[model samples]
Target chain A: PLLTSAIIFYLAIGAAIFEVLEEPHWKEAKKNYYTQKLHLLKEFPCLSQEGLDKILQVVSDAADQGVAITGNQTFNNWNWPNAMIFAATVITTIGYGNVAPKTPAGRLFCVFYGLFGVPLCLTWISALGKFFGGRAKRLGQFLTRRGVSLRKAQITCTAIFIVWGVLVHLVIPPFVFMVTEEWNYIEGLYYSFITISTIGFGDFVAGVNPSANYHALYRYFVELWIYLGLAWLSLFVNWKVSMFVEVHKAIKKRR
Target chain B: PLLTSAIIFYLAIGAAIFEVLEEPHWKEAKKNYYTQKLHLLKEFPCLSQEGLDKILQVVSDAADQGVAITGNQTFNNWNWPNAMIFAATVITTIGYGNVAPKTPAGRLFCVFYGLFGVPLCLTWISALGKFFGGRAKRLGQFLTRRGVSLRKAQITCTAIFIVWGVLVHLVIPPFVFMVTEEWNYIEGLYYSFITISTIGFGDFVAGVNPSANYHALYRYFVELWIYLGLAWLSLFVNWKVSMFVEVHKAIKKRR
Candidate 1:
């Protein structure tokens, strides 16, 4: 344990120092500032220093926001539904960056919250995996009781579930997205796969467009979907693991 | 047995429907599209239809690329280093949106890649956790043999590793990030924490700035840091889990 700790500590220190030495954000920001200053000077050469400073300050502020120039809709992360969504993402470890908390209070809370929350999540996932995995094993047994070969039953049952997941979980729902959010079929399909898998890249977050028409309960439904989807994926992994581990054990016994 | 399959299947259907229906990008894109068109129409009232159509075509093309106007650095997804990073993120379930697969071929590969990659990642993490966790447990036993109480030894050893991890893994990296990335101290610190946690919000990424002065080794080093940090964090989680499970068992036994 001590050696392991020491190794981890050494690696962390080395990486941190290297990152600090190599960080280029401030320099890049400075370069951008100067370039902006030159461009502003050329475009509005008659402006007073005060006016220029005010303009430059706005530019700097916009740079910090990352969306002011783009005119993108900034979701209200503190709103109850959004906050709940944020909390859910953090606990599940999906962490779609689309609606992160910027305040110091929020960030600090996040740190402490995670200390407890991550373990709670782990327990939930573990419990679900165990519960579902045992059941999947039983399905193979049920088949054997009905005179199916144990091996065939195991393979057949696993195959059935995989197909079931793809068709029900992966295939359907693009039309609903097309109607509800006016997205193309491909984009909707893409979003569904990304979220359920919990990769949650956040490139295509839903229901935060200020100008869009949506069902009044859109956000609520989405959150429910996230909760259910994550749980389902957990169950699938559990089932798959058990199915394989059992097969491996059987093969070892045969050997 | 059938019940577990039903539960998984039902949840999959729910997620698919919810995701497909609720995706909000196209509406947002259309909103931006019309707003631009209106702005353009107003700006050049005397423009010909053909000229206007030409401008709109370029706008459409830019929208597809997700950078119609803001001019953010669109890192090439096909590049070997970037592709490797993407694959790593998907398997780790980090899925940072900073640079994602945009092509149809890329997205299809991501889906299949994840099917196998996620398990491979889990296996690797599990192996490391087992190795490091055993070592930590042995350290506790060593302390106990030297006359420390079992509980006290466990707690002490755990505390030592926690301190070691925080210092080596968390504390020192921000200075490197702050210097190299030109971000404020807080931003660098925040980025490091987020990445190690594997939430990977991606609001702050390193080594993508086209103008930054960096050796060919910069991206390579950063990738190495990510891999090591992830494995270290996994070890910590595994150790903490075992310690708590042991404590919980003791408490239950006493009751």
Candidate 2:
């Protein structure tokens, strides 16, 4: 109940804030993003320019969060009812990438900041993944009539995940990169690695070639790849988490 | 096995190559950081002075990787071993901070590039952490002597984890950052967040602090806090994973 309350509380705060902010717009992007005439200011002359831009960007980020928090809120957005849904996605590492950062500070900070949180998120998630892995491991042991350690089974499940990353994140991205002429091999792989995982660093991108013959078809495929990869990874992650719980019961003889 | 092999191969190659290259003199500093020099050139190329420095820097990175790789094989340079250890610690998310990036680009790239892989690593890791967390959740359920749904039990375990992170990561870092005077509040929190998570972006560091009343005695305590926090989070995630597994098994039986 405390856990549900916490999740609900966080969601409520985000949702309430979203409703209030939408009426006024988070500082109005048109007023700041375009009207402040920043597209031309490649560099900031004074702190005022920087401060104003940051205010606008923060407002924009708030808006994006609003959309996530109060948007239709469906499986289209995690089947949740409020902004907490977006926060949940962020915490869960689902990172659909339907949203992205627009400001330089947001982009730069993201590039800089995820370093701290990503691992925390990972360690947290891996622990969950291991539980799911353990379950599968247990099943494998049962089917084979052999003793399988929870650690060993989890390792097997993890192996599946790493290979998937390499196959999808590294090998395929470069091929697509070359075909689209959108990015160099390393850059393509790098971008794909970032995007499918929902890192969305925006360092490299694809598509924009509908009339360029091969561009349009390849673009569609890349988009498909991203969605497919995300769903596949999420399923894998979710399964691994659940399987690990099975092992918990078998080993501890509880729950 | 393929995954294990990949880890071994990647590390082995890295070690052998870096063993010969991480010579003390070759390590990036104000003078040696090629990436930094290249950045200067990019920022202002009319100044051709960056080229000579850039060449030397590339040579250094190549040499360092080579030496570390060699140390992995032959253990030639004692320094190379420390670096090899650092690399492993980084990927494993242990990030003891025994050695770190010395160049501006090296540091920037460390944080920037990590944003992509760090999440993927965490997502992968959660698969493991969930296994551990599931055990704790199940234990909590039994000890409570209450009928808790498996999902509710999982949620409860996660709440405990947030409380733990808040104390170590959210609460403690600000105090450290405030006293230091070198870093702003967010930067302080950011540093603690990264170091403890073991993502170790090698940016805005402490514990190796120089001069002033920067709480010299508290560094180790903070470090330990982070380590403990990581361990606990990992366990919680593992529990959540385990919970999912039980749910799946129940589904299969009914089907």
Candidate 3:
């Protein structure tokens, strides 16, 4: 009974965390941030509706173009669900015995798919880590060169990492929402968080664009976004790890 | 209330799956599957029970004859709690990202360790997967090679895989049960499963061995065993995936 209650409690906690953690990401992704300011500017009419629509149309066209490129013969066979499923299997590394796959050419493709895909997935994350690590190190050098205090430099570098993470995890997803779907910022953020974290419960996935005109390219972009976003977060972690290591050594030396 | 119900449902489901899935493994590793049925009367009874005492004493003397093995140096440095802390880091993959060595030498070692260890860890799993998959395939081939029916060979291979999984999961942990300070086979299996799965909830771990005297080296060996055990389960998964690829390719070709 106690175990039951404990399980219930943790699940409740998980759900709450999921919802709350995802709000800003969803909202920002919807361009709700700019849309609000965009609303205020409507009174002034600095940019006419036609102009804005024209720009959005161009973006839609570009996105469509990307879709066309990705939709070509090479990627024609696979779709979002299949890619998502493959992504889930590799990252979890649970490897679930590949019970779902049942043929030779398919298996051969899968082996090649994993060969290309898994490393791409891993590389995306580690690159992000390296980028942030480099940034922080560079930021420290920049501050020292400028005569800023080391402590102040530390805060500045940290702020930059946070800002970068915020942009990737948030402000980005909701903007896509505004362009493609009626999803709230909350849902967009949730999608972003779930995808990047690789928890990928498969509750909500992208491929629901109202217009089916350019899905292949759109799906590819979403996958790219997830991998790129992970890379960014990894950079933040790299910064943290490098700092801690140096501090520990100094402490051991009684510095 | 509904949330609470779901939690209870999942836990019960999880435990039941574990029990049914792993119980057969325990039975296979039962140490002496035939000993009970083959109890023959012994007149001498190993030079009488009292004579056995002197033989054990001589064996003890031989073991202490400078074997150069000092078990578990970490035991003196850390109590069971700290070791639990260490194991928890290993399986979680979140890995705290901190407190690593500072010396150039230590840092280099960490890099080397991760590089070698990750693959070695993966190697053990892949090997086990190959072992199980090959064994299963061999059974299928047996029909062609030995003039057995296809149906019979298919049955032989599947039964072997199922039985192998049971022995590896259930049977091994219980005797591991004998050494753990915690006395029950269930808890031992639980700890083994939790760590190997890399869930690392940190509830219970080994190294609190309660036999004649605790040997740190012995505890370390036990640690390696859990590592191997994890590989055993994981490799079986890799084996299954390969089998699946074969199956998937054949079906795809038909289309």
Candidate 4:
């Protein structure tokens, strides 16, 4: 009950924070949107208000269905590479809305694909976690043998783990994306965190720029990074929880 | 290595399936999009190609940023209820991408929020899993005591768990959404599975309809269902893996 209340309070705080941060931009965008609409109306006198409204409605509806009617050529989302990335996102539970299935058949397939894919992916992730857990244990033992105090040794292992995990999974990847995706450092960092957390808000997706002809392997490499990064994150969470338990026990014993 | 290979193969299969299912629709949508563009160009004799292109560019940019220029009144996404739902999506890692944070501050706060909220939520979920696991054990024991064979009792417990879970989490929720959200049965099922898996492809989201005036508590109820459903899913996965291991060991002994 206490924890649930805390979560509710935390959610409220987050709500307030976002409302403050985004509402102004939203208002400005709304103003800009209306200005553009009026400009279009004035420029194209032959296009009646009703006709323009219908056009905008069609465009909006098409966009909502993942179709961009404005571009010279609509990108095929179900092409081999995009489809593979979509599959990866489904199994990983990232579901970046950049390229979701539009048809009912495709959507139904996605549900079943996720049903089996998620558990299979979890099985592999658990195996990787165990393998990494063994390596961490060996590293800890090595530090203990160097005459370091147990607490200091444990802290050292955790420090090394955090540094390595952050560098590989968060820092370096974001840096790479900063250069390659032409995103600012903050955008890159946010993308990394959102992706590794598997929140995957798709507002920032790699290789989706219509004009840019990225290498065929670019998405595959990103997908690989995402998978490996998720495994590292899972391991980090397990270690953090285990350390918390140990510290709690130590404090209890001292008291 | 074997498991990794299997996942790759599964992904490939999924890619092929989606490609086959969605490509025709993609082609048809492309044709429709061009037809609309051509029609707009023909209807407005004064609208030059460059002017139309600029308008589309502006509309596309605004749409990508989640601003709809077409509607009479643009919806405020950062209202209290919507913001609260966005916050819930962030912490739960079900980020539907329907209502993502547009500002850098909001995005930065989202990362930090997830950093703490996820682990806190995980702790609560694990506690719930433990509670449910105990009840399942008690039920199993009761069945065994009633002259049921151990294997049969295990099967019966599994059946009951699955049936109840499917009914509450899958069947009934989708049914309700089908009525309230006006989605077809398959759509409701697809939404339910995608959500509970935390994939949250924002292609379909509840309560985002611009004209609908749902009760204030509607989103809260849906959010509550999602949290409980995720907890249930976590328990189901644990039970499934444990059962697999037991069955594997039994087979090995017999062999």
Give the runs in model 3 whose Cα sits over 4 Å from its true position. Answer: A1-124, A147-149, A208-217, A242-255, B1-255
Compare the candidates by lDDT and give the number of the best one. Answer: 4
Model 1 off-target regions past 4 Å? A1-78, A125-160, A253-255, B1-78, B132-151
Tell me the tens digit of each residue's lDDT in model 3 across A6-107. Answer: 433433443343334333343343344345436633643644555444433332332212121112222211333443434334443223221122232333
lDDT of 1 by residue, B120-191 (tens): 666666666667668877876776788757645656777887887787666888788777878766666667
The candidates' DockQ values read: 0.12, 0.02, 0.01, 0.70
Cα deviation at A162, candidate 2, in Å, is: 11
DockQ of 3: 0.01
Cα displacement (Å) at residue A71, model 2? 37
DockQ-wise, the better of 1 and 4 is: 4
True contacts kept of 3: 0.00
Give the lDDT of residue A243 in candidate 4. Answer: 81
Give each model's whole-structure lDDT. Answer: 0.61, 0.44, 0.45, 0.79
The residue-by-residue lDDT of candidate 3 on B1-255, one tens digit each, is: 233244334334433433344334333322222231122113223233343233223223321221101222232122233324332232223222111122333323333333333333344445555665676577668656877466556556666766876687656766766654645655555445434544332224455322336554765576556655665666555555567788888797889
Model 2 interface CAPRI class: incorrect
Candidate 1, A1-255: lDDT as tens digits: 444454344334433432333224323433454454465456545544564444334333432333332334445323345555566677677777775645444455566556556666656666665665678668767767887576466567778767766766667766777787787767778778877777789777777776677777987787766665666677777677777888888898888
| Model 2 per-residue lDDT tens digits across residues A64-119 | 33122121222222111222222222332333333322233333343343543343
